[PDB]
Structure 1
Amino acid sequence: KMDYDFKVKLSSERERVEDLFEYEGCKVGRGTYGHVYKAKRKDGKDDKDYALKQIEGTGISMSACREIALLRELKHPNVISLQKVFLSHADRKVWLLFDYAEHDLWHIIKFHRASKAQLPRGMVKSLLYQILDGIHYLHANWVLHRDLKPANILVMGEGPERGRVKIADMGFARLFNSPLKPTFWYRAPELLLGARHYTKAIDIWAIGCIFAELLTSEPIFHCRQESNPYHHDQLDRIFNVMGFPADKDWEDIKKMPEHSTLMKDFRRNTYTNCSLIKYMEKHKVKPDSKAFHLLQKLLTMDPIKRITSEQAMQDPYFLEDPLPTSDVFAGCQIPYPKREFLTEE
Structure 2
Amino acid sequence: DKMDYDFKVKLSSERERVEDLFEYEGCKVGRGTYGHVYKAKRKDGKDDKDYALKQIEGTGISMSACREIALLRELKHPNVISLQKVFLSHADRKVWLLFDYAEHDLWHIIKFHRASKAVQLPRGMVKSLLYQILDGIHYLHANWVLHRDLKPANILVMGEGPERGRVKIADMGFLFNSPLVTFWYRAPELLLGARHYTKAIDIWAIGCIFAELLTSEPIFHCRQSNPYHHDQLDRIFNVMGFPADKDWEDIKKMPEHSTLMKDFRRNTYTNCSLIKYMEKHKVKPDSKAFHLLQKLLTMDPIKRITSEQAMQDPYFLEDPLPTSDVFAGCQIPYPKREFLTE
Alignment RMSD (CA, Å): 0.8
Contact 1:120 1:332 in 2 (8 A): no
> What TM-score do you get using the length of structure 1 for normalisation?
0.97
Flag the 1:19–1:127 CA change in 2: closer, same or farther, 3 A.
same
Flag the 1:340–1:219 CA change in 2: closer, same or farther, 3 A.
same
Contact 1:27 1:342 in 2 (8 A): yes
Contact 1:79 1:134 in 2 (8 A): yes
SS in 2 for 1:87: strand
Q: Distance in 2 between matches of 1:307 and 1:40?
A: 42
The corresponding residue for 2:84 is 83
| Alignment map for 1:264-303 (pairs within 5 Å) | 264-303=262-301
Contact 2:192 2:257 in 1 (8 A): yes
Offset of 1:116 from its aligned partner? 4.8
- What do the CA deviations read for 1:224-275 (whole angstroms, capped 9, x no partner)? 12x2110000000000000000010000000111000000000000100000
- What do the CA deviations read for 1:283-311 (whole angstroms, capped 9, x no partner)? 00000000000000000000000000000
Flag the 1:339–1:193 CA change in 2: closer, same or farther, 3 A.
same
Q: Distance in 2 between matches of 1:272 and 1:25?
A: 55
Q: Distance in 2 between matches of 1:9 and 1:155?
A: 41
Contact 1:27 1:37 in 2 (8 A): yes
Q: Distance in 1 between matches of 2:328 and 2:72?
A: 29
Q: Distance in 1 between matches of 2:122 and 2:263?
A: 44
Flag the 1:209–1:317 CA change in 2: closer, same or farther, 3 A.
same
- What do the CA deviations read for 1:75-109 (whole angstroms, capped 9, x no partner)? 00000000000000000000000000000000000
Offset of 1:179 from its aligned partner? 1.4
SS in 1 for 2:52: strand
- Structure 1: give runs of 5+ residues left out of the alignment: none
Flag the 1:283–1:121 CA change in 2: closer, same or farther, 3 A.
closer
Offset of 1:170 from its aligned partner? 2.2
Offset of 1:171 from its aligned partner? 3.0
Contact 2:121 2:216 in 1 (8 A): no
SS in 1 for 2:322: coil
Q: Distance in 2 between matches of 1:149 and 1:341?
A: 22
Offset of 1:202 from its aligned partner? 0.1
Q: Distance in 1 between matches of 2:184 and 2:101?
A: 27
Q: Distance in 2 between matches of 1:120 and 1:219?
A: 17
Offset of 1:342 from its aligned partner? 1.0
Offset of 1:30 from its aligned partner? 1.1
- Structure 2: give runs of 5+ residues left out of the alignment: none
- What do the CA deviations read for 1:93-129 (whole angstroms, capped 9, x no partner)? 0000000000000000000000051655410000000
Q: Distance in 2 between matches of 1:113 and 1:29?
A: 22
Q: Distance in 2 between matches of 1:307 and 1:170?
A: 23
> What TM-score do you get using the length of structure 2 for normalisation?
0.98
Contact 2:210 2:293 in 1 (8 A): yes
Q: Distance in 1 between matches of 2:35 and 2:115?
A: 29
Q: Distance in 1 between matches of 2:179 and 2:294?
A: 25
SS in 2 for 1:187: coil
Offset of 1:43 from its aligned partner? 1.0
Q: What is the aligned length?
A: 339
- What do the CA deviations read for 1:19-60 (whole angstroms, capped 9, x no partner)? 000111111111111111110000112110000010010100
Q: Distance in 2 between matches of 1:186 and 1:299?
A: 11
Q: Distance in 1 between matches of 2:257 and 2:264?
A: 10
State, as a whole percentage, how many aligned pairs show the same letter: 100
Contact 1:209 1:219 in 2 (8 A): yes
Flag the 1:120–1:221 CA change in 2: closer, same or farther, 3 A.
closer
Deviation beyond 2 Å, 4+ runs, structure 1: 118-121
Contact 2:201 2:301 in 1 (8 A): yes
Contact 2:193 2:254 in 1 (8 A): yes
Contact 2:67 2:173 in 1 (8 A): no
Q: Distance in 1 between matches of 2:262 and 2:300?
A: 20
Q: Distance in 2 between matches of 1:308 and 1:171?
A: 22
